[PDB]
């Protein structure tokens, strides 16, 4: 279902045993909810611009060069995503998580750069 | 994160333990305990959700820390000075 | 530090008098958990006989406590 809590509880039961007191659901910190949300919108908006630019060639191919109507399409999908976003926001407000995860550790621009730095150091060391 | 205790916090906790009984622990175990303390904070938060007296009592009974509210305020008396447990016994 | 500081940290993580008392009790339970884990690790180390306790005893004790509970 749309509610995150049902799947969250089911996967908690799968992950953790029954003597484990799962019946008590921790209220996640507002910062934790905000970080998970912000990751969601960052991914959504990045893929949004990427997809809207990717199919723009085919879109102009089949739309016969109508720009007012593609603006209409863009706005329609924009507030579709806005409504979905509000639903996800409220469902994450009611969704329960432990508050220890930071958005910095799940953005890719940091871990990817760390990996590149590590491999560069490895290359320098092997050459030496 | 911010929640896991620093080295000095664990040192003070083990000072209380030493007062209870002389026990020796090394340094790197403090960093290991800090990481596992973040893990156990997650464990306890999932163990204890919205804070209710009966909910917390049941969670700690299941965890084996206590056996009843009797052991609750007995441990509170063991680990803390007098006035806070006067407040606790008024509450409990 | 003090159990009061632990209760303050726990209420910071979560976010009156009864709520503060519940925080104090939860911090006492956390203290008991940590003491039990440290006691188990030290008993294992003394059974081995190492000059210094090492983090693998700590990890084993913590994982055993996590799996049991």
């Amino acid at each position: 279902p749309w509610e995150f809590r049902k799947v969250i509880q089911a996967e908690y039961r799968e992950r953790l045993p029954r003597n484990y007191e799962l019946k008590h659901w921790k209220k996640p910190s507002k910062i934790m909810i905000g970080s998970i949300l912000r990751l969601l919108e960052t991914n959504t908006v990045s893929a949004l611009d990427s997809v809207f630019e990717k199919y723009e060639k085919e879109m102009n191919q089949m739309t016969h060069g109508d720009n007012n109507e593609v603006k209409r399409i863009y706005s329609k999908k924009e507030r579709l995503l806005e409504i979905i976003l509000t639903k996800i926001k409220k469902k994450l407000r009611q969704a329960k998580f432990p508050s220890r995860i930071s958005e910095r550790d799940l953005d890719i621009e940091y871990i990817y750069s760390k990996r590149q730095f590590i491999q560069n150091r490895y290359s320098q060391e092997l050459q030496n | 994160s911010i929640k896991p205790l620093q080295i000095m916090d664990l040192k003070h906790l083990t000072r209380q333990f030493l007062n209870e009984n002389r026990i020796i622990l090394p340094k790197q175990t403090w960093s290991t305990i800090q990481e596992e303390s973040l893990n156990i904070m997650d464990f306890l938060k999932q163990k204890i959700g919205t804070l209710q007296k009966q909910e917390l009592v049941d969670s700690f009974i299941d965890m084996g820390i206590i056996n009843n509210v009797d052991d609750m305020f007995e441990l509170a008396h063991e680990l803390l000075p007098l006035e806070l447990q006067s407040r606790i016994e008024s509450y409990l | 530090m003090d159990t009061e500081a632990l209760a303050n940290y726990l209420l910071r993580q979560l976010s009156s008098s009864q709520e503060y008392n519940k925080k104090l009790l939860l911090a006492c339970g956390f203290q008991a958990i940590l003491r039990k884990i440290l006691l188990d690790a030290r008993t294992r180390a003394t059974a081995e006989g190492l000059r210094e306790v090492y983090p693998y005893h700590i990890e084993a004790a913590t994982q055993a406590f996590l799996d049991s509970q």
Side-chain angles (χ1 to χ4, degrees):
Chain A
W2 198 286
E3 202 194 83
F4 292 167
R5 194 175 174 180
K6 303 301 180 36
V7 193
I8 278 166
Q9 295 167 321
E11 292 167 342
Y12 282 175
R13 286 290 172 192
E14 179 181 1
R15 180 81 58 242
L16 302 157
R18 268 75 201 166
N19 50 9
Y20 190 86
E21 280 272 2
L22 267 169
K23 194 248 173 186
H24 309 163
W25 308 111
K26 168 64 164 66
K27 305 288 100 175
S29 71
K30 303 295 185 290
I31 302 173
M32 170 88 258
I33 299 170
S35 80
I36 288 299
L37 193 81
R38 275 173 303 172
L39 183 56
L40 294 174
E41 289 90 7
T42 45
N43 292 340
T44 299
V45 167
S46 49
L48 185 63
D49 59 66
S50 78
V51 162
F52 182 69
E53 188 262 335
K54 267 207 59 169
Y55 207 80
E56 201 176 358
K57 277 75 68 178
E58 288 90 56
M59 181 195 328
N60 293 344
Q61 274 175 347
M62 283 74 74
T63 50
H64 311 88
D66 287 333
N67 291 319
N68 297 319
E69 305 201 62
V70 60
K71 174 33 52 183
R72 258 160 51 195
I73 295 299
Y74 193 29
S75 51
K76 274 182 98 56
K77 172 251 295 179
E78 185 65 33
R79 83 289 184 276
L80 285 174
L81 289 179
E82 283 299 321
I83 293 160
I84 291 167
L85 209 64
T86 51
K87 271 178 285 180
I88 293 316
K89 163 64 153 292
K90 82 184 190 309
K91 250 69 182 184
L92 194 59
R93 286 310 171 185
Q94 63 77 22
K96 305 293 98 177
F97 287 127
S99 304
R100 61 89 172 173
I101 302 101
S102 171
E103 190 187 0
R104 208 163 170 270
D105 208 12
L106 282 71
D107 187 70
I108 56 171
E109 304 300 286
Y110 187 68
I111 322 292
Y112 174 110
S113 60
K114 184 83 177 296
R115 157 162 184 274
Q116 303 316 95
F117 182 76
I118 284 287
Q119 78 182 4
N120 207 4
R121 284 304 313 284
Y122 186 63
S123 80
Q124 294 212 321
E125 288 299 89
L126 60 90
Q127 193 159 247
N128 186 41
Chain B
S1 64
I2 51 173
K3 174 62 186 69
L5 303 148
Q6 299 320 292
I7 315 300
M8 62 182 180
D9 300 330
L10 316 167
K11 282 312 285 182
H12 301 120
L13 293 156
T14 46
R15 145 85 183 170
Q16 279 185 176
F17 201 52
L18 280 151
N19 289 344
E20 176 57 59
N21 194 42
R22 287 217 284 164
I23 290 306
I24 300 105
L25 285 146
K27 171 61 204 79
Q28 295 87 235
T29 51
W30 305 134
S31 163
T32 311
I33 281 294
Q34 169 172 336
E35 302 308 285
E36 291 160 14
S37 192
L38 173 80
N39 203 24
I40 287 306
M41 175 264 292
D42 303 319
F43 173 83
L44 276 167
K45 287 331 192 181
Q46 280 310 109
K47 268 271 182 158
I48 306 146
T50 318
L51 277 296
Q52 281 78 245
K53 174 162 122 179
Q54 297 300 109
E55 187 163 357
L56 178 74
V57 162
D58 194 2
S59 196
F60 276 172
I61 283 172
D62 207 307
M63 264 182 267
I65 297 142
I66 69 160
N67 304 145
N68 48 354
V69 70
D70 190 12
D71 203 75
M72 211 65 158
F73 49 68
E74 277 166 309
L75 178 86
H77 158 56
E78 174 196 44
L79 296 175
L80 277 152
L82 185 135
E83 193 260 333
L84 305 160
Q85 280 71 245
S86 158
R87 192 164 174 188
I88 281 289
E89 191 76 29
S90 291
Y91 174 57
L92 288 185
Chain C
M1 61 79 71
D2 276 315
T3 315
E4 303 286 320
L6 198 55
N8 292 341
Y9 295 150
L10 290 153
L11 66 91
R12 164 188 73 188
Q13 275 299 131
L14 162 75
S15 298
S16 87
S17 65
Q18 49 185 359
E19 296 290 328
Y20 201 68
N21 286 341
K22 285 181 274 193
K23 299 289 94 176
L24 193 66
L25 296 172
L26 200 154
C28 286
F30 191 24
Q31 286 186 102
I33 279 180
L34 195 54
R35 282 153 79 113
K36 283 160 189 47
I37 288 171
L38 290 167
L39 191 145
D40 292 334
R42 188 212 44 94
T43 46
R44 284 167 38 87
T46 47
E48 192 296 330
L50 287 169
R51 319 297 204 99
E52 299 172 354
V53 177
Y54 281 136
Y56 65 93
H57 305 272
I58 301 277
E59 286 152 354
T62 307
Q63 288 329 290
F65 185 73
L66 277 149
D67 184 40
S68 61
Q69 286 329 291

